[PDB]
Amino acid sequence: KAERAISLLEKDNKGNYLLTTSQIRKLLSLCSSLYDRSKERKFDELINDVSYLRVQFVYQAGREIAVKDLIEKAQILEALKEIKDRETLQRFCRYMEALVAYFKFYGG
Amino acid sequence: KAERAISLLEKDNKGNYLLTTSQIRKLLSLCSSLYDRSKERKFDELINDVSYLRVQFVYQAGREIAVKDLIEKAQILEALKEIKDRETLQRFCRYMEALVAYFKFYGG
Amino acid sequence: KAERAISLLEKDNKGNYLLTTSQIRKLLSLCSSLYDRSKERKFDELINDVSYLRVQFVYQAGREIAVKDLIEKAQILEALKEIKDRETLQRFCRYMEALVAYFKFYGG
Amino acid sequence: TFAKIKFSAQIRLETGLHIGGSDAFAAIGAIASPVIKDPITNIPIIPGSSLKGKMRTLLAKVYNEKVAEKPSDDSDILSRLFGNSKDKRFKMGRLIFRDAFLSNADELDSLGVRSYTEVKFENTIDRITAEANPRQIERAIRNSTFDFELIYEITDENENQVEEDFKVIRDGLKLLELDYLGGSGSRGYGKVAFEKLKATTVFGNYDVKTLN
Amino acid sequence: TFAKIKFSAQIRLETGLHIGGSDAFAAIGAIASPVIKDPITNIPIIPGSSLKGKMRTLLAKVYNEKVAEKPSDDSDILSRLFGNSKDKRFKMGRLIFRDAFLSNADELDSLGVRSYTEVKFENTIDRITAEANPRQIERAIRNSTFDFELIYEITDENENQVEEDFKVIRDGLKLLELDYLGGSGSRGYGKVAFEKLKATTVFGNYDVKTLN
Amino acid sequence: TFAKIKFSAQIRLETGLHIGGSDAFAAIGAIASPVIKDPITNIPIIPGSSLKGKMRTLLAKVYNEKVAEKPSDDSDILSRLFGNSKDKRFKMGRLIFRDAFLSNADELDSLGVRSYTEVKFENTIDRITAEANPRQIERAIRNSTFDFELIYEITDENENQVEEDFKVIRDGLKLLELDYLGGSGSRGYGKVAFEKLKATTVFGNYDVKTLN
RNA sequence: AAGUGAACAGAAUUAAACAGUUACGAAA
Structure with a gap:
């Protein structure tokens, strides 16, 4: 979870x-706005935001070279299909914070 | 919705x-200007934009061979008749992003 | 434990x-809210707050210059891996209080 | 004798304002000016401390005859409404607010919204260069109601000054609508509007006379 | 004593301008800087922060006696109108703006319109070569109005120069009409036009002097 | 000291040119590049962005001695009129354009016309084969006026090149008349004519100096 | 039918970060 995120993110290129x-x-902005809302109501009620969350990882992956090199290494699209329960979605929200805190640890 | 669109769009030709x-x-441009306007007022009031959206998929479809081949595969004209409610129209607007985000994933 | 906190914290720079x-x-805020809660239930149950505690020492380390110079000297990230038991975690909660008492004695 | 008058109203936000929450205490999104919300759910709630201090500030500048040098010491006609820490005759006030919650969730989800609070981007000019220090703030939604209840009670002895106190509360609520509420309202973010101003009796000991 | 003067006016846009909203934060269309709109509806509203930083900048270069180098520090005749972060005499500003909403929607659909925002094709040429970087923008509608309200109030003591403040606000609003407002208005996008500049009294404590 | 000099002129189109505006946005068919018009009505309007990149390019060849490649990097006597994205002294520009609207429709429609934009039939020859590629373009009317106002203002402090700025604007507008304006201006489509070139004062701080 | 990949910097800062009216009340 947090142990393998410090070595895979550091190994890049230039x-x-x-x-x-x-x-x-x-x-x-949507991953942080989904964890605090999924803990209140059920998971089967919010069906319009789950399908829209996967689009953000695809539309923004072809407009910048600094996005495709990170999704293929961290395997983001693979975890979007295994999730299906409200408790499983809470685990993916905590893993996203590792790609932001450890990214600015060596630079910015 | 978003699972069957990643395989149908990739299977093309040359x-x-x-x-x-x-x-x-x-x-x-008309699809992006429809999801954000149908949520304010009712659906029975906007009558000059619903019928005008179907015309764009008929007149402009015969001006280039690179247009009809994508509409028949994605089944766009079929979903224009099933919609009739404001909640149903919101579902078709989210499916349009699959033909744009996944299109630039393999090239551009 | 508490004897080396008076010399390592005082030796700084300007x-x-x-x-x-x-x-x-x-x-x-999370260090004081962990020692008073880990004594009630078991340690294997709280698996969401342990991984989140390490994130606070990474995201806040690359924003202010007055944070990286203190973690590398006090070895905060080193003690986060040796802990694994509920009794061992109780010792790390007492070491954090030593870096605050001696910090306000020489200034504020 | 002793009644519990409740002035129920609906605070309609005609313009999205900002309230400074608990900074450096929330989750990873503690930047962009974190706005205080519900400690259990995600529905943004407005605190009651920003209402008692703002209503008394605008009231202590038109119904007085001396410049207030320190709090809890200004005139006497309004000191019994909010309280006094230096007086020996009266201590407890007669106006109790309440942390109103966003009760507009019954129809807000039908319109399909993204989040409860958005992030607005602003900056400043150093009057010598172009863009500098790209800051960012956080605001709320527009046209949202709030269940505001005013707990009013009398001390039995203060019965001959009931109609005189009604014109002070009505003047304070109407004047508050023409001023920003919360924080960072100098650019035009506050300006509330009390909708459906009515009164009712819960304990049942005093008649119903006022309304609007 | 304490009055609440309201300067109601209609901001008529003689030319469609552009205002850079929250970048990388929209909904279905976030291409070429999505213009900020309403968090509930779709009508693009103008923020009140642009009306405070632009009007003060254009006024601090004609009514001053020293070249300014940082905000909250320019002359003294205009520091009490917007605020001061260094002077201990006054801190709050006497001018309160408001996010003006587009009230022209009651008759805009009768003229036959398509949408509220359109995409304008505007790129650049690198001189030495042909077309390079075919960028684009997103403008709003043309010939639209906004219900703007100017909340003005006095602090009792600020009474012996009420007429001196009226000529400053009137000169500042008229000067803004001959200048672009918003962002990237160098290509002829801004240029506002304040229509029906009148004054009224809501609280009722001061007489009516100006009107046009 | 600090005035708002306005240069009111009438742009007369001697030949129906073509400007590639917001294409692929027409009524019932976007064929042959639909010319951008009014976002509310149907009267064709000329964009003010085309009058800024073309006038600066035709001027940055005579009032300078160094052939530059990227704009905002040339000399200094001409970069102030349009802006500089490198110098720290000045950043904003003194010239403000305006999207001039076709004001000639008040009397042209009385004669009896069909539409404002027509389609011209053209073709091309590759000098190796016969006639191919049946393309077509869209042009406008002939002899049409526009309301183009040039807003100019000084910074009071740096008031020295007053007479120098007059000879640059006058020569820049005269040189544009002898050259095509817009796209596809190689077949004799541009060539504008600034009719009635006069100046006036709107603010009221500096006397009328220039005129012709 | 006709290369179309909005480019390049700052990523929230400088005040102020417990102020005061004050303490076993009437039995063995």
Whole structure:
């Protein structure tokens, strides 16, 4: 969960990351707004946001080169299909924070 | 919705798609301006835009061979008749993003 | 445990510390809310707060310069891996209180 | 003698305002000015401390004859409405607010919204260069109701000044609509509007005379 | 004593402008800087933060005696109108703006319109070569109005120069009509036009002097 | 000291040119590049963005001595009129354009016309084969006026090149008349004519200096 | 039929971060 996220994210390519934490505030705004809402009501009620959450990881993956190189390595699209329960969705929301905190640990 | 769209859009013919994002800037504007307007007022009031959306898939479909081959495979004209309610129209607007996000995943 | 906290924390660099006790109320809120809760239930049950505690020492380490210089000297990330038992976690909760008492004695 | 008058109203936000919540205490999204919400659910709630301090501020500048140097010490006609910490005659006030919650969730989900609070992008100019320090804030939705209940009670002895106190509460609520509420309202974010201003009796000991 | 003067006006847009909303935060269409709109409906509303930073900038360059270098520090005749982060005499501002909403929707559909926002094709040429980087923008509608309200109030003591403040607000609003408002209005996008500039009294404590 | 000089002129189109505006956005058919018109009505309007990149390109060849490649990187006597994205001294521009609307429709429709934009039939020859590619374009009317106002303002402090700025604007507008404006101007479609070039004062702070 | 990939910087800062009227009341 958090042990394998410190080594896979560091192993990249050329240094000096030109991507900051402000240009990726589109695909990260729905994951933070879903964990706090799924803990109140049930999971079978919110059906319009689950299908729309997967689109953000595909539409934004062909408009920037600093996005496709991170999804294929961290395997984001694979975890979007295994989830199906409300308790399982809570685990994927905590793993997304590892790709943001550890990303600015070596630079910004 | 989003699971069957990743396989049907990929299965095409010859590679190197000539249909870029320039020739699709006409039919993708009315769909984006429909989901955000149908949620305010009622569906029975907007009558000049529902019938006008079907005309774009008939007149503009015969101007290029690279248009009819995508409508018949994605089944766009079939869903234009089943919709009749404001809640049903919101479902068809989310399916349009699958033909744009997944289209640039393999090329552009 | 508490004897080396008076020499390692005092040996720093330039005087007049600009960091007070109000800007560090984020990473010090989960340490006090963990020692008083791990004694009731078992340690194998709370699996969501343990992984989230390490995130606070990573996201807040790359934003302020007054955070990275303290974690590398006090070895905070090193003690997060040795702990694994409920009795061992009780010792780490007492070491954090030593870095705050001696910090306000020399300044604020 | 002793009654419990309740002034039930619906606070309709004609303009999205901002309320500074508990910074550096929430989750990973503690930036962009975190707005305080519900500690259990996600429905944004408005605190009652910002209402008692703002209503008394606008009231202590038109119904007085001396500049207030320190709190809990200004005139006397309004000190018994909110309280007084330096007076020896009266201590407990006669106005009790309530942390109103967003009760507009019965029809907000039907319109299909993204989130309860959005993030607005702003910046500033140093009057010597172009864009500098790209900051960001957080606001709420527009046209949202709130269940606001005013707990009013008399001390039996203060019975000959009932009609005089009604014109003060009505003047304070109407004047509050023409001023920003919360925080960062200088740019035009506050300005509330009390909708459906009515009164009722719960304990049942005093007649019903006022309404609007 | 304490009055609430309201300067009701209609901001008529003689030319469609562009305002950069929340980037990377929209819904179905987030291409070429999505313009900020209403969090409930779809009618694009103008933010009140642009009316405070632009009007103060254009006024601090004609009514001053020293070149300013940082905000909240320019002359003194206009510091009490917007605010001051250094002076201890006054902190709150006497001018309160409001997010003006588009009230022209009651008759806009009768003229036969398509949508509220359109995509304008505007790129650039690198001189040495042909077309390079075919970018685009997103503008609003043309010939639209906005119900803007200016909440003005005095602090009792600020009474011996009420007429001096009226000529400053009137000159500031008239000067804004001959300048672009919003963002990237250098290509002829802004240029507002304040229509029906009148004044009224809501609280009722001061007489009516100005009107046009 | 600080005035708002307005240059009111009438752009007369001697030949129906073509400007590639927001294409693929017409009524019942976007054929042959639909010319951008009014977003509310149907009167064709000219965009003000085309008058900024073409006038600056035709001017950055005579008032300078260094052939530049990227804009906002040339000299200094001409970069202030349009802006500079590198210099720290000045950032904003002093010239404000305006989307001029076709004001000639008040008397042209009385004569009896069909539409405002027609379709011209053209073709091309590859000089190796016969006639092929039956293409077509869309042009406008002939001899039409427009309301183009140039808003100019000084910064009071840097008031020295007053007479120097007059000879640049006058020469820039005269040189544009002898050159095509817009796209596809190689077959003799552009060539505008600024009729009635005058100046006036709207604010009221500086006397009328220039005129012709 | 006709190469179309909005480009490049700052990623929230400088005040103020417990102020006061004050403590076993009447039995063995």
